[PDB]
Design an enzyme around this catalytic site. Sequence first.
Site, PDB file in Angstrom:
ATOM      1  N   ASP A 188      -1.822  -4.091   0.769  1.00 16.73           N
ATOM      2  CA  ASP A 188      -2.003  -2.722   0.267  1.00 16.73           C
ATOM      3  C   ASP A 188      -2.407  -1.710   1.351  1.00 16.73           C
ATOM      4  O   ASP A 188      -1.815  -0.627   1.431  1.00 16.73           O
ATOM      5  CB  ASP A 188      -3.006  -2.691  -0.904  1.00 16.73           C
ATOM      6  CG  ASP A 188      -2.610  -3.620  -2.052  1.00 16.73           C
ATOM      7  OD1 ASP A 188      -1.452  -4.120  -2.072  1.00 16.73           O
ATOM      8  OD2 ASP A 188      -3.461  -3.844  -2.952  1.00 16.73           O
ATOM      9  N   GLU A 214      -3.263  -3.443  -9.562  1.00 16.61           N
ATOM     10  CA  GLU A 214      -4.708  -3.518  -9.358  1.00 16.61           C
ATOM     11  C   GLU A 214      -5.435  -2.780 -10.494  1.00 16.61           C
ATOM     12  O   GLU A 214      -6.439  -3.270 -11.025  1.00 16.61           O
ATOM     13  CB  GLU A 214      -5.084  -2.919  -7.994  1.00 16.61           C
ATOM     14  CG  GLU A 214      -6.579  -2.602  -7.827  1.00 16.61           C
ATOM     15  CD  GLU A 214      -6.906  -1.951  -6.483  1.00 16.61           C
ATOM     16  OE1 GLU A 214      -7.093  -0.716  -6.460  1.00 16.61           O
ATOM     17  OE2 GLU A 214      -6.957  -2.666  -5.453  1.00 16.61           O
TER      18      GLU A 214
END
Lengths: 262, 262
Positions: free
Chosen positions: B52, B165
């Site tokens: 990420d 997420e």
Amino acid sequence: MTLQQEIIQALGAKPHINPEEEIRRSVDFLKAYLKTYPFLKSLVLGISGGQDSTLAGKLSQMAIAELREETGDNALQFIAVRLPYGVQADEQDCQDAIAFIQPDRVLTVNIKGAVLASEQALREAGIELSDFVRGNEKARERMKAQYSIAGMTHGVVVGTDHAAEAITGFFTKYGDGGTDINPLHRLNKRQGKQLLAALGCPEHLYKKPDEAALGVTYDNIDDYLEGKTLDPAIAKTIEGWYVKTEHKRRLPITVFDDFWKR
Amino acid sequence: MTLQQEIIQALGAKPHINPEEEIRRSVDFLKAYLKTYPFLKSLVLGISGGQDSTLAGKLSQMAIAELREETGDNALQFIAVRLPYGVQADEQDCQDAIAFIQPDRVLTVNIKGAVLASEQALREAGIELSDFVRGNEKARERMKAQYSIAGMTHGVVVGTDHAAEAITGFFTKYGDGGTDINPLHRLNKRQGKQLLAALGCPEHLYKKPDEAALGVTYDNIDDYLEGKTLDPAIAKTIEGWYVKTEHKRRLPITVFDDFWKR
Ligand SMILES: NC(=O)c1ccc[n+]([C@@H]2O[C@H](COP(=O)([O-])OP(=O)(O)OC[C@H]3O[C@@H](n4cnc5c(N)ncnc54)[C@H](O)[C@@H]3O)[C@@H](O)[C@H]2O)c1
Ligand SMILES: NC(=O)c1ccc[n+]([C@@H]2O[C@H](COP(=O)([O-])OP(=O)(O)OC[C@H]3O[C@@H](n4cnc5c(N)ncnc54)[C@H](O)[C@@H]3O)[C@@H](O)[C@H]2O)c1
């Protein structure tokens, strides 16, 4: 719609309020929230002896005390947290606020060591912080302490934000702005005083260059929030702070947001 | 509307994406934001060598590099920040991510001293933190460091949050959730990988009990975000985390909110 109308609507401010009604609205909101998430057992709040935390603290303790009597749940607790920067004596306003609130529990956490440690780590990385940025650092350490306490006591963190603070963005992003539940949101500054008067708060804890911003008094801000027409110079200054700090009153920005676009 | 449909719509997730299009959408979003607030000069991001942050870092550096060439403004800078907990050697994934990104500036800030200082202040107040709560404390210290750097460099803090997420709320409230601008918001996990592949990222930085949650894999989460029908047990678990963590994806709660009410 004028910018003044947009600001008033966004913050939920009204020209006049019934103090007894608003006290009840806030207390019942806190109680209803706790009843919805019954694993929650604590309301956590940093107290300083200032107007806003004294008000939010009194309302929080009332919420807890009532819910505890109704449910018989002796685990319910209001936790007041003193957050001094350094061993800097004991302040009377804070002691008087505690006497008025009668909190279930009082914790004292000295944030200076952690703030100095943060500064030293930055110093080693080649970054020297200004006094101004250190103030925001302190506000974030106070947030951190309250969240750690909440984390250990099935708590939520109560915020003191209200219309007269939010309009100018005069709070630290993810510092005193980093909270879970805000029972004072909608009220202007003088209205907070009316609630404290109705609750029997000692006058010295809320009775008042002292200004909200350069060339802007709290009476100016409250009058603006109540829809009054001020000197264009005062209104423009207020409106400038609001627009500048839109980012503080919104979630992190994504590709779907349009509010920031010209 | 089903809960799956509500979740997908809220997070902005799509069943399929064009990687080149999404790379451009994210880069142009960052550039347009900076151009709207021309006093801003830096994009600040914590990098770990993980998928990420490697993706958000590459997109941020591209945004800065392009805007700098277009405007001739040599003050524009992408600032990568290594945030280790302790002097724990030097990790190869992070070094490889730096080689790929070619950041303008790399800062290294050891957060351990501040976290230990926070813990000692709580210890003196009578509160011993669990390993679990200390993890959230660390995430909040990383937030604090990035905000202090932003504060000293006319910067904004880039967040790595994305749909895979956010759906479970698997981030720390005001920790890695405390950001200014989120260029990955809308994307699922496998889609992030497609962007990295299109950018020529070394495969070992994104190529994969390893699970997102108990009995839930990242493939399960991505499939759910793409509108697929899963085992009711998997879907129920995913939906339970979403509902539990609504508070993490919303602003502090006020008397005007109704989403939390039964
Ligand atoms: N007249 C006054 O009394 C007055 C005036 C100004 C500020 N305040 C005080 O200063 C302190 C807050 O200072 P601050 O606002 O510099 O710190 P802050 O940390 O609250 O906000 C600044 C941070 O927000 C982010 N940011 C800045 N512009 C952004 C944008 N356009 N979009 C997205 N993110 C952006 C950046 O990360 C930056 O580091 C508070 O204590 C406040 O009350 C008081
Ligand atoms: N299966 C997994 O991998 C898994 C499972 C759960 C959590 N996570 C991890 O745990 C960490 C986060 O833990 P966390 O969520 O306990 O910490 P957090 O600090 O992110 O959130 C908890 C805090 O939110 C507030 N809060 C809790 N319930 C609330 C409510 N109903 N309304 C308003 N506020 C509320 C409280 O202040 C509480 O201290 C992250 O690293 C996350 O990824 C992982």
